[PDB]
Motif scaffolding. Structure first.
Motif, PDB file in Angstrom:
ATOM      1  N   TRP A  49      -6.722  18.252 -34.344  1.00 35.22           N
ATOM      2  CA  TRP A  49      -7.076  17.517 -35.555  1.00 35.22           C
ATOM      3  C   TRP A  49      -8.408  18.058 -36.096  1.00 35.22           C
ATOM      4  O   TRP A  49      -9.215  18.566 -35.360  1.00 35.22           O
ATOM      5  N   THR A  50      -8.617  17.978 -37.390  1.00 34.42           N
ATOM      6  CA  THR A  50      -9.868  18.441 -37.917  1.00 34.42           C
ATOM      7  C   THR A  50     -10.922  17.393 -37.655  1.00 34.42           C
ATOM      8  O   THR A  50     -10.782  16.207 -37.995  1.00 34.42           O
ATOM      9  N   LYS A  51     -11.967  17.823 -36.994  1.00 39.21           N
ATOM     10  CA  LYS A  51     -12.990  16.915 -36.596  1.00 39.21           C
ATOM     11  C   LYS A  51     -13.912  16.592 -37.730  1.00 39.21           C
ATOM     12  O   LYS A  51     -14.435  17.470 -38.391  1.00 39.21           O
ATOM     13  N   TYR A  52     -14.064  15.312 -38.003  1.00 39.65           N
ATOM     14  CA  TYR A  52     -15.059  14.875 -38.956  1.00 39.65           C
ATOM     15  C   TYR A  52     -16.225  15.687 -38.517  1.00 39.65           C
ATOM     16  O   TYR A  52     -16.350  15.946 -37.323  1.00 39.65           O
ATOM     17  N   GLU A  53     -17.081  16.110 -39.426  1.00 39.22           N
ATOM     18  CA  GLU A  53     -18.307  16.818 -39.011  1.00 39.22           C
ATOM     19  C   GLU A  53     -18.069  18.252 -38.494  1.00 39.22           C
ATOM     20  O   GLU A  53     -18.899  18.843 -37.882  1.00 39.22           O
ATOM     21  N   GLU A  54     -16.901  18.777 -38.753  1.00 40.33           N
ATOM     22  CA  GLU A  54     -16.601  20.161 -38.486  1.00 40.33           C
ATOM     23  C   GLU A  54     -15.754  20.427 -39.739  1.00 40.33           C
ATOM     24  O   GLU A  54     -15.201  21.520 -39.941  1.00 40.33           O
ATOM     25  N   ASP A  55     -15.705  19.384 -40.586  1.00 40.85           N
ATOM     26  CA  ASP A  55     -14.964  19.350 -41.852  1.00 40.85           C
ATOM     27  C   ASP A  55     -15.821  19.911 -42.972  1.00 40.85           C
ATOM     28  O   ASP A  55     -16.723  19.259 -43.443  1.00 40.85           O
ATOM     29  N   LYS A  56     -15.466  21.112 -43.432  1.00 39.29           N
ATOM     30  CA  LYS A  56     -16.264  21.862 -44.423  1.00 39.29           C
ATOM     31  C   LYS A  56     -15.973  21.470 -45.850  1.00 39.29           C
ATOM     32  O   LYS A  56     -14.819  21.494 -46.298  1.00 39.29           O
ATOM     33  N   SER A  57     -17.014  21.126 -46.574  1.00 42.99           N
ATOM     34  CA  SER A  57     -16.879  20.745 -47.960  1.00 42.99           C
ATOM     35  C   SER A  57     -16.656  21.968 -48.884  1.00 42.99           C
ATOM     36  O   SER A  57     -17.231  22.028 -49.966  1.00 42.99           O
ATOM     37  N   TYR A  58     -15.813  22.919 -48.469  1.00 43.22           N
ATOM     38  CA  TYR A  58     -15.630  24.180 -49.210  1.00 43.22           C
ATOM     39  C   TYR A  58     -15.420  24.119 -50.738  1.00 43.22           C
ATOM     40  O   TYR A  58     -15.866  25.012 -51.451  1.00 43.22           O
ATOM     41  N   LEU A  59     -14.770  23.083 -51.241  1.00 46.26           N
ATOM     42  CA  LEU A  59     -14.491  23.009 -52.676  1.00 46.26           C
ATOM     43  C   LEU A  59     -15.635  22.395 -53.459  1.00 46.26           C
ATOM     44  O   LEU A  59     -15.881  22.760 -54.594  1.00 46.26           O
TER      45      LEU A  59
END
Ligand code: HEM
Ligand code: HEM
Ligand SMILES: C[C@@]1(c2ccc(Oc3ccccc3)cc2)OC(=O)N(Nc2ccccc2)C1=O
Lengths: 109, 377, 47, 79
Positions: A79-89
């Motif tokens: 799962w994508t970890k909150y806080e490893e979740d990149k705000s790329y857009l």
């Protein structure tokens, strides 16, 4: 114009992190920005991404759509970890919103 | 040979064979084709019933019985029609719910056309129900028609106009037969226009995220998914027709005409219950009918109240809870609409009515805004 | 009041009996065709 | 409408797939399906179920009051 840390900020973070887990897009491998509603400002932001990000988002979305059809999810380990979740857009989107807002302010005079 | 070049099959191909569709659309997406099947169902049985029904005040109730007793298999055709009308609403409801939950209303035009399709079928079913000239058919016809009388200044010239007299009589049964025959053909045209606007973007999906990276052809996949689902619509329809013909059907329409005597407790069909409760809640003539209209006309405000940065409610725990509270509230309205206007019931009925509007006009939009903040968007 | 009563339930029988044949079968037809998607595997291989 | 060939740009993804006549249509129908439904159920009960028990509770109460209040009633009128 700075210093603070708070046990409270962590609670806020804990509430966000809680909702993030509850939202569940991370079970499909998605990242927050992958789930945004494509309006015009957004389509343009997608359009401005560099190849790598543009391609990564495509594969992630495919991976999720494919999960959705099987009504499955990824192993918890993935799962994508909150806080490893990149705000790329975000930064592209913010910039495309700024320029539009500028056009709008010019159209007023 | 080719499906693609022929001016005619090209439409078919682009609508049912090569149309790119999301690999992930759910069972919830089956209802649109089921609504099409419903319309065709209503059309065929409707028609054969018209080969034997008569529209005059005297023989109306009688001709219908002629069908159920005398005409070969009229009973099965008559029940399929009646139970088909219920299924049609079952499908409208799911279809409209699916659009809300999943944000599908964001396709403005196609959603707006849907509302028109909703009002058109409601208009259609109303005229239909009056046709056998039973007690409820008559009194239901009397109640609903009189709503128009609330309209200020022109209210009464209008009801009398739509009546073709001083009350629901002869003239009305005949015109209702006529309008009820043409409406489904007009519906059919609006539905093709509905499908046209939809193809412009293609279908939405459970995630609310574009599926252009994972489209599949409508044909082998949705062709079979739709077949399977049609058979389910059929089982559910037959169960009613063949085991419970009178279950949704009120016992009072089995007794002819009484412009002189209103039944003790007149009860709407089923699919009008929730709206009937809303109209009734408020003790006012004008305000009731206004609340009634708004209760349905609200669907077209829904798109302005979208507040979330996401399309679907799939990743939205708050909105999900409020959505079901909406459903649970409608189910309450349904229960209440089928009950006498008395003590426990009027108060429950007034609180559910504010809740319906409170949650659409204010609760849902506020949940969307806090879900955005929670995500740092 | 209901002369058709007996024919209806004989039909009704047939409807569940037939439905009990067709339902599983049509369901199996759809799974067959959807096999290809259900078991498909993906791999991303960027430069 | 839109056609395959003009939807969108995709780079670098491989899709492997089998012929239907080569695979099962119901592999582990029960072995894997049951667990799966239990899991989708857990994932949604908290959002779906509560509003409905709330209606359920108001449904039984509401009718209860109705009966006891009007009919059953005629309580005391003592002389
Ligand atoms: C092809 C256009 C249609 C025709 C020609 C048609 C014809 C008829 C006729 C002759 C009756 C009176 C006989 C009877 O009551 O059994 C009737 C009743 C009715 N029809 Fe239609 N109809 C059509 C479309 C619809 C539609 C769109 C609906 C809505 C789903 C509808 C739902 C009803 C209902 C509820 C009744 C009252 C049924 C009852 O309880 O007897 N029909 N129709
Ligand atoms: C005669 C009544 C209707 C018919 C025949 C009809 C037919 C269809 C069909 C065939 C689809 C294609 C895919 C699907 O099954 O979802 C569809 C999708 C849709 N319809 Fe309808 N429908 C009707 C009533 C409505 C109503 C009442 C609304 C809303 C008030 C509505 C708004 C939509 C929308 C928004 C979609 C979008 C698809 C999605 O987002 O998944 N339609 N409809
Ligand atoms: C079948 C029925 C009906 C059909 C369509 C309707 O249209 C709407 C449905 C839902 C919301 C708004 C309108 C409403 C009632 O027609 C009819 O005579 N009745 N009976 C009735 C009984 C009491 C009061 C008012 C009506 C219906 O239920």
């Amino acid at each position: 114009g700075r210093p603070a840390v708070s046990a409270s900020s962590r609670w806020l973070e804990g509430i966000r992190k809680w909702y993030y887990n509850a939202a569940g897009f991370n079970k499909l491998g998605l990242m927050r920005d992958d789930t945004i509603h494509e309006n015009d400002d957004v389509k343009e932001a997608i359009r401005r991404l560099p190849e790598n990000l543009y391609d990564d988002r495509v594969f992630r979305i495919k991976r999720a759509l494919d999960l959705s059809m099987r009504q499955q999810i990824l192993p918890k380990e993935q799962w994508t970890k909150y806080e490893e979740d990149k705000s790329y857009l975000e930064p592209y989107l913010k910039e495309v919103i700024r320029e539009r807002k500028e056009r709008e302010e010019w159209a007023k005079k | 040979n080719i499906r693609k070049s022929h001016p005619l099959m090209k439409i078919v191909n682009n609508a049912f064979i090569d149309l790119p569709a999301p690999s992930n659309i759910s069972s919830w997406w089956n209802f649109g084709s089921l609504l099409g099947i419903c319309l065709i169902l209503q059309i065929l049985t409707g028609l054969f019933l018209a080969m034997h029904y008569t529209s005059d005040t005297t023989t109306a109730f009688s001709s219908v019985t002629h069908i159920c007793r005398d005409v070969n298999y009229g009973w099965i055709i008559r029940y399929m029609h009646a139970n088909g009308a219920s299924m049609f609403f079952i499908c409208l409801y799911m279809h409209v719910g699916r659009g809300l939950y999943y944000g599908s209303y964001t396709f403005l035009e196609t959603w707006n056309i849907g509302v028109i399709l909703l009002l058109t079928v409601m208009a259609t079913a109303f005229m239909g129900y009056v046709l056998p000239w039973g007690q409820m058919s008559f009194w239901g016809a009397t109640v609903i028609t009189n709503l128009l009388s609330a309209i200020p200044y022109i209210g009464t010239n209008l009801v009398e106009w739509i009546w073709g007299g001083f009350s629901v009589d002869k003239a009305t049964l005949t015109r209702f037969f006529a309008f009820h025959f043409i409406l489904p053909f007009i519906i059919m045209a609006i539905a093709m226009v509905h499908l046209l606007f939809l193809h412009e973007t293609g279908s939405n999906n459970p995630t609310g995220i574009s599926s252009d990276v994972d489209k599949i052809p409508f044909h082998p996949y949705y062709t079979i998914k739709d077949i399977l689902g049609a058979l389910l619509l059929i089982l559910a329809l037959m169960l009613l027709v063949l085991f419970a013909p009178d279950l949704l059907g009120d016992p009072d329409n089995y007794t002819p005409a009484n412009p002189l005597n209103t039944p003790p407790h007149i009860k709407p069909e089923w699919y009008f219950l929730f709206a009937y409760a809303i109209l009734r809640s408020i003790p006012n003539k004008l305000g009731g009918v206004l609340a009634l209209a708004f209760s349905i006309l609200i669907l077209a405000l829904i798109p302005l109240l979208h507040t979330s940065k996401q399309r679907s409610m799939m990743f939205r725990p708050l909105s999900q809870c409020l959505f079901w509270a909406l459903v649970a509230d409608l189910l309450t309205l349904t229960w209440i609409g089928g009950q006498p206007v008395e003590h426990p019931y009027i108060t429950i009925g007034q609180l559910a009515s504010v809740l319906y509007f409170l949650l659409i006009l204010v609760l849902m939009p506020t949940a969307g805004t806090i879900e955005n903040k929670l995500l740092k968007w | 009041a209901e002369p058709e009563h007996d024919h209806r339930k004989r039909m009704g029988l047939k409807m569940l009996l037939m439905m009990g044949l067709l339902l599983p079968l049509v369901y199996a037809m759809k799974r067959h065709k959807w096999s290809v998607l259900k078991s498909r595997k993906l791999a991303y291989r960027p430069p | 409408g839109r056609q395959f060939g003009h939807l969108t740009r995709v780079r670098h993804v491989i899709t492997y797939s089998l012929s239907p006549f080569e695979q099962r249509a119901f592999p582990h129908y029960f072995s894997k399906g049951i667990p799966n439904v239990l899991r989708r159920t857990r994932a949604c009960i908290l959002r779906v179920a509560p509003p409905f028990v709330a209606f359920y509770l108001v449904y039984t109460w509401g009718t209860q009051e109705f009966e006891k209040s009007k009919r059953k009633n005629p309580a005391a009128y003592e002389n």
